[PDB]
């Protein structure tokens, strides 16, 4: 399918709660969606697998949720190190992945 990033958190500051979200053109299983953080100059790293599960070592603030056609990253409280481009990933039935356009979260 196709994902629409619809960026809603382009300009935030430390201590604020992120409402960064992703909308799929079709509903998808929550187990097939994931969130990634890409810092400038570095390869993307996985943050959230499924709709709400934390992957590797990560701050407790990176607790997301979602269902159906609407998923939200929900960063509890931002820190300076959290400003990065966030990508929404959707896994299909075939061994294929699609990414959104990317929401740039900056100071």
């Amino acid at each position: 399918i196709v994902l629409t990033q619809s960026p809603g958190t382009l300009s935030l500051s430390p201590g604020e709660r992120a409402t960064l979200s992703c909308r799929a053109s079709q509903s998808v299983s929550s187990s097939y969606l994931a969130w990634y953080q890409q810092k400038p100059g570095q390869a993307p790293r996985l943050l959230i697998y499924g709709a709400s599960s934390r992957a590797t070592g990560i701050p407790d603030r990176f607790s997301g949720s979602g269902s159906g056609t609407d998923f939200t990253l929900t960063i509890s409280r931002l820190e300076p190190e959290d400003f990065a481009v966030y990508y929404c990933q959707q896994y299909g039935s075939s061994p294929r992945w699609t990414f959104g356009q990317g929401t740039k979260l900056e100071i």
């Binding site: 994931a34 896994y91 992945w97």
Partner: peptide, 13 residues
């Protein structure tokens, strides 16, 4: 598990 449907290890670029 849902972990194995994601790309959790990336190269350098």
């Amino acid at each position: 598990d849902s972990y194995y449907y994601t790309m959790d290890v990336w190269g350098q670029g």
